[PDB]
C-alpha cells in the first residue's frame, strides 16, 4: 500500500503580522515538497529527486496553490476566533491533513481530509467522503457552510482521481527509491545496572519504510508490558531508527530474545545477546 499525504499548518500571531502558513507533502515516508509563507522567497520547493525534474511550469503551479491556500487559511483562522468568542490577542493554530491511499492492488483504497483547531479535532470528512463529523457547536457552523456549498463533493473529486494520478506518477518517477524496502541493520547491547540487574537493548537502524515492530521475549513469551520503546526516529538520509530495551536479572540474559518484523525482512528476525 502506497500513499500521498499533505500536512498544512497555519499559526496566528496578533500584533506581529499575518498568520504564517507551512505545507509539506509526502509519498509514503519520503517528503517531496515544502512551502513556508515566511520563507525568504515563498515558493514550492523540492525535497526529493523524483520531483526536481518536473519543470518550472509544475513548480509555478504548486507555488500558486500554496499562496492561495495560505490566504484562505488566514480567513479560516479569523472565522474560528469568532465562533469561539476568543480574544483578538491570542495566537491560534489551524492544521489540516489530506491525501489518498493506493491499496495493494494499485487502486484507490482510501482518502481522507481532516482539520484540527489548537491541537484538537475540529471537523473531518468521514470515510465515505460524503458526510462530516464535527467535534462541537463551532464545528457545526463549518459543517452547515460546507454541506450547503457541496464542499465534500469537490474534495472527493480531488481525492478520487487527481490525488491518485499524481501518486501513481510519483511512484513511477521515483521507483528506484520509493518501491524498495531497506531491511533493518540490527544488534544488541548490554548495560549492567546494579549488582543483579542489567539492560538489554535491541537496535534497528537504516530501515525503510518507517513501520516496524520490536518485541522482547523471555523463554519464547512476549513481554509487552516491561519493554521500553522509543519513538521511531529519522536518521536524516531517508531511513529510520528504533530501539527496545528490557531490564533483566543478571545471569538470565540468555533467556531473552528480540524479535524484529519489517517489510524488508523475508522472515522475522530473532536476536540474542
Amino acid at each position: 500500500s502506497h500513499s500521498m499525504r499533505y500536512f498544512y499548518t497555519a499559526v496566528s500571531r496578533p500584533g506581529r503580522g499575518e498568520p504564517r502558513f507551512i505545507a509539506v507533502g509526502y509519498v509514503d515516508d519520503t517528503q517531496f515538497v515544502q512551502f513556508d509563507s515566511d520563507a525568504a522567497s515563498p515558493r514550492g520547493e523540492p525535497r526529493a529527486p523524483w520531483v526536481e525534474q518536473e519543470g518550472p511550469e509544475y513548480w509555478d503551479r504548486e507555488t500558486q496553490k500554496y499562496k492561495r491556500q495560505a490566504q484562505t487559511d488566514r480567513v479560516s483562522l479569523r472565522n474560528l476566533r469568532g465562533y469561539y468568542n476568543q480574544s483578538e490577542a491570542g495566537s491560534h493554530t489551524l492544521q489540516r491533513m489530506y491525501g489518498c491511499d493506493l491499496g495493494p492492488d494499485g487502486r484507490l483504497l482510501r482518502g481522507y481530509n481532516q482539520f484540527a483547531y489548537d491541537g484538537k479535532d475540529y471537523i473531518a470528512l468521514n470515510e465515505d467522503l460524503r458526510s462530516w463529523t464535527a467535534a462541537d457547536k463551532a464545528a457545526q457552523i463549518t459543517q452547515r457552510k460546507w454541506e450547503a456549498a457541496r464542499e465534500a463533493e469537490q474534495r472527493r473529486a480531488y481525492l478520487e482521481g487527481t490525488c491518485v494520478e499524481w501518486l501513481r506518477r510519483y511512484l513511477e518517477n521515483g521507483k528506484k527509491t520509493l518501491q524498495r524496502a531497506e531491511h533493518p541493520k540490527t544488534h544488541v547491547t548490554h548495560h549492567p545496572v546494579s549488582d543483579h540487574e542489567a539492560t538489554l537493548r535491541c537496535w534497528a537502524l537504516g530501515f525503510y519504510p518507517a513501520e516496524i515492530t520490536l518485541t522482547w521475549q523471555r523463554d519464547g513469551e512476549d513481554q509487552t508490558q516491561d519493554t521500553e520503546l522509543v519513538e521511531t526516529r529519522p536518521a536524516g538520509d531517508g531511513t529510520f531508527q528504533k530501539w527496545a530495551a528490557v531490564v533483566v536479572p543478571s545471569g538470565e540474559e540468555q533467556r531473552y530474545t528480540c524479535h524484529v518484523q519489517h517489510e524488508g525482512l523475508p522472515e522475522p528476525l530473532t536476536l540474542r545477546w
Binding site: 499559526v11 509539506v24 491560534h92 493554530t93 491541537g119 484538537k120 547491547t189 529519522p234
Partner: protein, 100 residues
C-alpha cells in the same frame, strides 16, 4: 487549547566512530503549539550552521522537527541538545549518549 511538551532524542545518523565523519541529530516530537527553539551544543557552546527539517505533525496533531549537523566525533568531545518551549520553565538539555 493543547499544550504538550516535546520528547527529545539526541543521536547520530550512523554508529559513531572516532575520526569518521557523521551527522548529529536532535529529534523533537510530540509538542504543541509549534513554536520551539532547538540548539545543538559542542562542549557547552552553541553550534553554528545547524539545519532543520520542515514543520510536520503526527496523526495525533503533535508536531515534530529534526535538527542536524555534520560532525566528526572524537573521544572527549561532548555534545548536547538544548530545547526551549512554552511548556518548559527552563531550557531542557539532553546530552548525547553514544554507547546506548
Amino acid at each position: 487549547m493543547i499544550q504538550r511538551t516535546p520528547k527529545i532524542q539526541v543521536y547520530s545518523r550512523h554508529p559513531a566512530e572516532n575520526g569518521k565523519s557523521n551527522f548529529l541529530n536532535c529529534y523533537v516530537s510530540g509538542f504543541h503549539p509549534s513554536d520551539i527553539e532547538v540548539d545543538l551544543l559542542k562542549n557547552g557552546e552553541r553550534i553554528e550552521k545547524v539545519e532543520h527539517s520542515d514543520l510536520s505533525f503526527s496523526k495525533d496533531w503533535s508536531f515534530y522537527l529534526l535538527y542536524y549537523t555534520e560532525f566528526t566525533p572524537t573521544e572527549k568531545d561532548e555534545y548536547a541538545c538544548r530545547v526551549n518551549h512554552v511548556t518548559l520553565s527552563q531550557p531542557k538539555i539532553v546530552k548525547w549518549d553514544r554507547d546506548m
